[PDB]
UniProtKB/TrEMBL annotation, chain A:
<keyword id="KW-0949">S-adenosyl-L-methionine</keyword>
<feature type="binding site">
    <location>
        <position position="246"/>
    </location>
    <ligand>
        <name>S-adenosyl-L-homocysteine</name>
    </ligand>
</feature>
<dbReference type="Pfam" id="PF00891">
    <property type="entry name" value="Methyltransf_2"/>
</dbReference>
<dbReference type="InterPro" id="IPR012967">
    <property type="entry name" value="COMT_dimerisation"/>
</dbReference>
<feature type="binding site">
    <location>
        <position position="247"/>
    </location>
    <ligand>
        <name>S-adenosyl-L-homocysteine</name>
    </ligand>
</feature>
<feature type="binding site">
    <location>
        <position position="219"/>
    </location>
    <ligand>
        <name>S-adenosyl-L-homocysteine</name>
    </ligand>
</feature>
<feature type="domain" description="O-methyltransferase C-terminal">
    <location>
        <begin position="190"/>
        <end position="341"/>
    </location>
</feature>
<feature type="domain" description="O-methyltransferase dimerisation">
    <location>
        <begin position="31"/>
        <end position="100"/>
    </location>
</feature>
<keyword id="KW-0489">Methyltransferase</keyword>
<keyword id="KW-0808">Transferase</keyword>
<feature type="binding site">
    <location>
        <position position="263"/>
    </location>
    <ligand>
        <name>S-adenosyl-L-homocysteine</name>
    </ligand>
</feature>
<dbReference type="InterPro" id="IPR016461">
    <property type="entry name" value="COMT-like"/>
</dbReference>
<dbReference type="Pfam" id="PF08100">
    <property type="entry name" value="Dimerisation"/>
</dbReference>
<dbReference type="GO" id="GO:0032259">
    <property type="term" value="P:methylation"/>
</dbReference>
<dbReference type="GO" id="GO:0046983">
    <property type="term" value="F:protein dimerization activity"/>
</dbReference>
<dbReference type="InterPro" id="IPR053173">
    <property type="entry name" value="SAM-binding_MTase"/>
</dbReference>
<dbReference type="InterPro" id="IPR029063">
    <property type="entry name" value="SAM-dependent_MTases_sf"/>
</dbReference>
Length: 378, 361
């Protein structure tokens, strides 16, 4: 395994045993600090691009990158301990190198590059995380007391959106399998709305899966520019378009067969979330679906599965950057009901869940009239 | 258990599938940032002390700590997701609390408290880690160009030493078993020298195991004070002494049956390490042992075990704070030989190895 503690050497019976064992486990969690520090320093120094160009021992890489030889040995061996880089052995020793899969993740400009995540950490998240205590003290509530949506800004997303492309393929595969099993097909026309599309990868992969479909991505102008470039890269530009502007305005159009919200709801407040859900219902075809892809957990907020654990942690990442949450199934169901929609599927993905919702079929149990309206206003 | 990625849902072996899997695995390693941030913020806010005093729902704890109620729920549920705090969920809602073992680790002033580690990260390590690239560029070198020893200062050790007490019990029990299997018994007297003793816990646990032994700890003034107070709490004060000051000034003594270096050699340069080893040999009694407890790896520097993997990372933690290393078995053997010592044993512990050496002549 990749454990940093040999737990076979820790006992666990007495009160002291158990305190010592817990302390080792907490220490292992604390030194998780070191991995982003090592990986992001290596990015700043040019290590990954250099190894991809020419595998080298630590002294040669230090020469090429104008670094100290011993410190570079320390850095590269740490990356090796994290399984981030590999070794190739010669008759006289070894060189460090990147596997093909690691190259895709670590170099700039690739489809699944994490560089935008490295830069988001360096520029935004690292300094924020050290100030977490002050943000918990004060909250995300504005001066008037109202909560704020998440504070990651468009200039920050210019780096970050490409750094989260890696999430998309498993999600789109799972979504497409369900769409096909429920009767959808790529040989008939259909329209997708991708709200806050980022690079557009989710709808672009859908376009590749369903060759007669079209997609419209909503985002701010500087991100829409990225999305159109990526649509061309993936060969789907004839069926992908963007509409720039603030998606909270609504008026998204008509007749959409699928409205996708990937990594959007966690940025919202409850008020902004229900408004978005209402905009989605307003633009949906009669038989259309809304797909929510997010960090979603039951109201019990128990860390049972990896997706549950990640969701609980992701809520802290949202608080760290100024607002949002990891919302519960029951909160999404409130919002679906408020928008005249009904959840019909929940699907697991590596770090997310997908909720699918359709237009509701049955009426409220309270009939139309002033009593219903007073309940609505309250 | 700990995983944040459902790897069962990352399938296939096409080039794309492998790249996506790797990206998820690298992302999971990057978000390890979040755990110390959550834990250390909770410490700063007084969360652990408040939960120990009275379990609480999140809204009550927010009122007690003058924090935002929703943000407190988020923080507490993250701590629960990390298995750091406990939480009961019943028809009355959620209540957060500490287990007995977590209380020992998370509150100040306990024997195994990690508070000193929290404070070391907040005050020293976290700002340094953000600047790691600069130290790699320039090297852990002094103005003359020579390798520098680690830079953590004595005032920083005043917090940190109590925060690493948790390492000691597994190490001392392993060491004690090997000393007893080596004919060293209770009821026979022996003298221990604990070089850079920190809180003195390694010595003090040996004193509890071997009731006729005595131990002398070498450390700086303010840490010797901590070590004596802890010996008193552990009931071994009559057999534990300290010799306060820079151990490079000497005044170590002679006739020691055991000379212990726990978490010392990784702070050294090769030049300072060989000098320390020679000093140790000179103070040994006949049949005395030197015990090195450290992050030790083969020269191949392969992460074949947890201890090897941790050692390679610990070398980066040393570089981060200005010098030192995780040295190799081969380097220790060179230093032993230069000092007239010979390695006789290597013992594994949860995050370290123990090397034992004795005089060859
Ligand atoms: N009010 C708003 N109007 C338009 N775009 C917005 C917005 N608030 C957030 N966004 C966009 O929403 C995106 C959130 S990041 C998620 C991007 C993409 N859906 C993916 O999952 O990879 C960013 O691209 C950001 O620019
Ligand atoms: N030159 C020196 N003289 C005296 N003490 C020193 C020293 N250099 C380092 N130390 C001490 O060495 C210790 C390193 S931390 C390890 C402490 C203890 N052996 C443990 O393993 O828990 C600190 O207490 C520090 O103050
Ligand atoms: N919080 C994530 C980044 C992120 C932000 C917004 C999103 O919509 C998605 C991902 C991180 O720091 O790793
Ligand atoms: N480098 C360790 C702390 C440490 C420092 C010096 C030591 O001798 C031992 C431990 C950490 O940051 O977790």
């Amino acid at each position: 395994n990749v454990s940093l503690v040999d737990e076979s050497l820790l006992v666990g019976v007495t009160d002291e045993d158990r305190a010592v064992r817990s302390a080792h486990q907490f220490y292992e969690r604390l030194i998780g600090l070191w991995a982003p520090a090592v990986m992001e320093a290596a990015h700043e120094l040019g290590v990954f691009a250099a190894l991809a160009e020419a595998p080298a021992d630590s002294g040669e890489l230090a020469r090429r990158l104008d670094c100290d030889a011993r410190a570079m040995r320390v850095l590269l061996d740490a990356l090796y301990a994290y399984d981030v880089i590999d070794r190739i052995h010669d008759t006289n020793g070894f060189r460090y190198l990147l596997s093909a899969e690691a190259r895709e993740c670590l170099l700039p400009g690739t489809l699944f590059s994490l560089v935008g995540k490295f830069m988001h950490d360096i520029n935004v998240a690292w300094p924020a995380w050290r100030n977490l205590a002050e943000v918990v003290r004060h909250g995300a509530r504005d001066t008037s007391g109202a909560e704020s949506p998440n504070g990651i800004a468009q200039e920050d997303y210019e780096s970050l959106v490409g750094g989260i492309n890696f999430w998309a393929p498993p999600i789109v595969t799972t979504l497409s399998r369900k769409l096909r099993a429920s009767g959808r097909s790529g040989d008939a026309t259909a329209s997708v709305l991708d709200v806050g599309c980022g690079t557009g990868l989710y709808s672009q992969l859908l376009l590749r899966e369903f060759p007669r479909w079209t997609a419209t991505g909503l985002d701010v102008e500087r991100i829409a520019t990225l999305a159109n470039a990526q649509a061309l890269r993936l060969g789907v530009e004839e069926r992908f378009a963007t509409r720039a502007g603030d998606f909270w305005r609504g008026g998204w159009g008509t007749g959409y067969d699928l409205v996708l919200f990937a990594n959007i709801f966690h940025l919202q407040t409850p008020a902004s979330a229900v408004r978005l859900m209402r905009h989605a219902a307003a633009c949906l075809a009669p038989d259309g679906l809304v797909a929510v892809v997010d960090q979603i957990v039951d109201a019990d907020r128990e860390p049972k599965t990896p997706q549950d654990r990640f969701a609980l942690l992701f809520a802290a990442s949202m608080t760290n950057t100024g607002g949002g949450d990891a919302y519960t199934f029951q909160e999404y169901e409130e919002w679906f009901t408020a928008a005249g929609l009904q959840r019909i599927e929940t699907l697991d993905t590596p770090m997310h869940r997908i909720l699918l919702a359709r237009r509701a079929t049955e009426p409220s149990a309270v009939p139309e009239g002033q009593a219903s309206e007073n309940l609505y206003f309250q």
